[PDB]
Amino acid sequence: HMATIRNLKIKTSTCKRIVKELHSYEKEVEREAAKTADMKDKGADPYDLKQQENVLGESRMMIPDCHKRLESALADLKSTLAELEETEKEGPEIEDAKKTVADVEKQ
């Protein structure tokens, strides 16, 4: 029904946002990992290196939690799609949701 599609839109947006958050966390990891490498070949002392290794470690710890939220959002979206498939011509919102499901599953 129409309300289900409006729900679908929100759930699609939620997935897209969490993917964006995930990518942001991932980019932070990549940047922190590159900084770690730069400090190592630059001969940073063990204290500074440890500090940076902790920063990297914590950046990485953001990722699984983000995945969990993403997986939850993907389940929410898929559930709504499944509800709509129960009815059911495909328009832009279902298209967008399905595209987003595909994008999320690639993460």
Describe this protein's structure:
It is a single chain. The protein starts with a helix and ends with a helix. It has 107 residues and is mostly helical. It has helices at 2-41, 46-85, 92-105. It has one domain (1-107): Up-down Bundle (Methane Monooxygenase Hydroxylase, Chain G, domain 1), CATH 1.20.58.90. α2 (46-85) runs antiparallel to α3.
| Order of secondary-structure elements | HHH
C-alpha Rg (nearest Å)? 19 Å
Second-tier CATH architecture = Up-down Bundle
CATH class: Mainly Alpha
Oligomeric category:
monomer
* Fraction in beta strands: under 5%
Number of helices: 3
Biggest sheet overview: none
How many domain modules? 1
Shape: rod-shaped
Number of strands: 0
Name the structural class: mainly alpha
Question: How far do the termini sit from each other?
Answer: 30 Å
Per CATH, what is the topology? Methane Monooxygenase Hydroxylase, Chain G, domain 1
What percent of residues adopt helix (DSSP H or I)?
Answer: over 70%
PDB class: chaperone
Keywords: helix bundle, Chaperone
Assembly: monomeric
Entry title: Crystal Structure of tubulin folding cofactor A from Arabidopsis thaliana
Give a quick summary of the entry.
Tubulin-folding protein involved in the control of the alpha-/beta-tubulin monomer balance. Functions as a reservoir of bound and non-toxic beta-tubulin. Required in the developing embryo. This protein is mainly alpha-helical and 107 residues long. Helices cover 88% and strands 0% of the residues.
